[PDB]
Ligand binder design. Structure first.
Ligand code: HEM
Ligand code: HEM
Ligand code: HEM
Ligand code: HEM
Lengths: 146, 141, 141, 146
């Protein structure tokens, strides 16, 4: 995504205040709780039986953190998203076989999480710009599949 | 397919939303028009201003039907047949549009009610909004 | 949601399949393994070579589940509950794969039963399969 | 998408037997019957109220033909599908507002329509090659929502 300078400001303005530890973790857990088939990919992580188990699972949090740092690196290369996510695309396509459809799901869980943390400050306009990022991250993660 | 925990979750959370639904509906609508512009091609005949009074009125009508549905979780086809005739036969809404509004509703709830929007509630609510969507986009009359 | 016209069409065409469900189910699997290789991931323990006897046997089981499903069209959550247990709790099959297998089933049917595969029957069986798929990827008890 | 020489041969060898007058109208008829919200896009085509009305509408048949020779031009330029659909892509994005999820559906419909006509000779290897085609055409047609 080429974002307009207004959108870029809305996004980067809010990113600056995200506890990248908490949030990476909550978005991943919620992914495994809400779309539970996603648990199949994370079997070596421990008990993923109950919502609580998933939200408190240490390995889930740690992986949350990588996911988000990956997102953070994304925010730095906004106008080369496809090349910035080249390597993660191959890994997810050819090594792990995660259908491209789940990336838009994680984007959506991610957006819900940011709404949950920032309530009133997550205004419709700010949301419009995050939908554009997440959509762009998702497309960039899908390059090698098509 | 909604599980019982799903239902006791869906009813629980709607208790809290409750008298505020009217504005959550409008916020949700506003959120969607704004984040997915194509959705506005469905309301050519509406004021889509930020303060819009019709959008508010329509949010209230949306939220009522959602209240209606929480009361009828064991027979949604029965309860929403009229809304289904409207959305499926008459207006012919593309189902992707439901995914967008359903997502914007969740985001709205998350915003106003973080303490009630636990992972599990999130989960039941998403199943709920998508069952509702299947009924509204099915032709079964 | 199915209308009783869908139900009528689902029964009709399934009766026309007759004693051939087994072959169709196997062929449908073959095509899905072959057009969408990543589905094979779910069967690391099978002989997937073409013509395989594990595949024909499994097709027979898939087609019986469908015959079972066609017989309980008013209560698919009830009738399919063990299969939902298997695909949703135990195997955790990505829903996308159900779309893939469903499409390959319809192609299989269209290619063997052209006269029957009328648009209206096509439309019904797709609802049918998507209705089945939802139940098998839902966790409801 | 990205076809091997052998897949190009299956795809081109079948297509020479394809009745371009019948097949496009049958593809589009079925899209409108199976995925009925797609009728909203074609209101000005007549009453579309029954499977039989839809399948006998002469505007449906004639639009169908257009769709299908568009796919033919596609086949003559497999290695640059994006390029050959750039215009069609704008049309369906800015003017018509067609969600790209519907391009996939028309694609699968077309394939079902192929299997219908060709029966036994629509072998799983041949289908596999067409699935790559329709995936690739659905994708070309979508990249102007970027
Ligand atoms: C926004 C989309 C996503 C992004 C940006 C992302 C990012 C990442 C990153 C950075 C890694 C670690 C790679 C490394 O440094 O070695 C990773 C690994 C992994 N990802 Fe994702 N991911 C995303 C979505 C998903 C989804 C939806 C799934 C499953 C449904 C998934 C499954 C996995 C798996 C199984 C691993 C290997 C983890 C391990 O065993 O350590 N990813 N991803
Ligand atoms: C959970 C989702 C939805 C619910 C519960 C819902 C419910 C309703 C209700 C209660 C009405 C009022 C009918 C009346 O009494 O006049 C209505 C009308 C309408 N709906 Fe929806 N709807 C939903 C989704 C959608 C979506 C996704 C769209 C497309 C973006 C849509 C488009 C419309 C339109 C265009 C009208 C008529 C507006 C007017 O002229 O007043 N709906 N809907
Ligand atoms: C309508 C769609 C489907 C039906 C009707 C169906 C039906 C069945 C049945 C009847 C069984 C075995 C029951 C038993 O022996 O106890 C089974 C097992 C299984 N299914 Fe499906 N299934 C469907 C879709 C899928 C899909 C899309 C996948 C993934 C690509 C899948 C993966 C599996 C696996 C891995 C097994 C275990 C087989 C074994 O290890 O012996 N199923 N299914
Ligand atoms: C996926 C393959 C598709 C191809 C190859 C294709 C191709 C075309 C072509 C050739 C035209 C006419 C432009 C002209 O005649 O100059 C057209 C227009 C149009 N397309 Fe598509 N299309 C596809 C999918 C779709 C889908 C899925 C929809 C909506 C369900 C759609 C909706 C329309 C509409 C409403 C028009 C305007 C036709 C008219 O009113 O004259 N198209 N497309």
């Amino acid at each position: 995504v080429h974002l307009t300078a207004e959108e870029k400001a809305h996004v980067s303005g809010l990113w600056g205040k995200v506890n990248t530890e908490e949030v990476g973790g909550e978005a991943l857990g919620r992914l495994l709780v809400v779309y539970p088939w996603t648990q199949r990919f994370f079997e070596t992580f421990g008990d993923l039986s109950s919502a609580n188990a998933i939200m408190n699972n240490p390995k889930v949090k740690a992986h949350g953190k990588k996911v988000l740092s990956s997102f953070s690196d994304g925010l730095k290369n906004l106008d080369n998203l496809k090349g910035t996510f080249a390597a993660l695309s191959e890994l997810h396509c050819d090594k792990l076989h995660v259908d491209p459809e789940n990336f838009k799901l994680l984007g959506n869980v991610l957006v819900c999480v940011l709404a949950h943390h920032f309530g009133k400050e997550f205004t419709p306009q700010v949301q419009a710009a995050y939908q554009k990022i997440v959509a762009g991250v998702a497309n960039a993660l899908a390059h090698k599949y098509h | 397919v909604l599980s019982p925990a799903d239902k006791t979750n869906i009813k629980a959370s709607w208790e809290k939303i409750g008298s505020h639904g009217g504005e959550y509906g409008a916020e949700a609508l506003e959120r969607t028009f704004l984040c997915f512009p194509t959705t506005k091609t469905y309301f050519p005949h509406f004021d889509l201003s930020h303060g819009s009074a019709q959008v508010k009125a329509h949010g209230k009508k949306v939220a009522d039907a959602l209240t209606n549905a929480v009361g009828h979780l064991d027979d949604l086809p029965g309860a929403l047949s009229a809304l289904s005739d409207l959305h499926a036969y008459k207006l012919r809404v593309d189902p992707v549009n439901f995914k967008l509004l359903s997502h914007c509703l969740l985001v709205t709830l998350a915003s106003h009610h973080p303490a009630e929007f636990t992972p599990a509630v999130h989960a039941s609510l998403d199943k709920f909004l998508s069952s509702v969507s299947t009924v509204l986009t099915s032709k079964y009359r």
